[PDB]
């Protein structure tokens, strides 16, 4: 399956072209070139749509700690941004390796103040995850929940997801 979310509103005109509201979700069925035929997750009704008005989900984005398609340095601007604290954290698509993730954590050094630290979460040929080859997890929540009980190598034991 392919789950999309509408980026903008779509006022259709034709019998079999599905309108929608920004944010609306939709199962993508067929694909007629650049028009995706979908089945709206509200209406329940089917019609063709502009692929470029929507965007796949992956979620994962059901998680308050996943920030999708975010650059390394934007990720820093995020946590360092007011509203956050120390330990504040986040996980994201590793632009340096698609399908693979990194964890950015808000740290601190007295010689400079509020810091951000990045950790390369590697995956196993077996499908789980780990940051240090001392703690392997079958899932990311599982991971997140580890380092939120204590740092275990990481700069700070995790607190709450980036704001």
Swiss-Prot record:
Give the organism the record lists. Homo sapiens
Entry note about domains: The SH3 domain mediates binding to HIV-1 Nef.
Tell me which residues bear Phosphotyrosine: 130
Location(s) in or outside the cell: Cytoplasmic vesicle, Secretory vesicle; Cytoplasm, Cytosol
Q: What is this protein called?
A: Tyrosine-protein kinase HCK
Q: Tell me the protein family, please.
A: Belongs to the protein kinase superfamily. Tyr protein kinase family. SRC subfamily.
Coverage span on the entire protein: 80 to 242 of 526
Describe its partners and assembly state. Answer: Interacts (via SH2 domain) with FLT3 (tyrosine phosphorylated). Interacts with VAV1, WAS and RAPGEF1. This interaction stimulates its tyrosine-kinase activity. Interacts with ARRB1 and ARRB2. Interacts with ADAM15. Interacts with FASLG. Interacts with CBL. Interacts with FCGR1A; the interaction may be indirect. Interacts with IL6ST. Interacts (via SH3 domain) with ELMO1. Interacts (via SH3 domain) with TP73. Interacts with YAP1. Interacts with ABL1 and ITGB1, and thereby recruits ABL1 to activated ITGB1. Interacts (via SH3 domain) with WDCP.
Q: Which disease does the UniProt record connect it to?
A: Aberrant activation of HCK by HIV-1 protein Nef enhances HIV-1 replication and contributes to HIV-1 pathogenicity. Aberrant activation of HCK, e.g. by the BCR-ABL fusion protein, promotes cancer cell proliferation.
Q: How would you describe the post-translational modification of this protein?
A: Phosphorylated on several tyrosine residues. Autophosphorylated. Becomes rapidly phosphorylated upon activation of the immunoglobulin receptors FCGR1A and FCGR2A. Phosphorylation by the BCR-ABL fusion protein mediates activation of HCK.
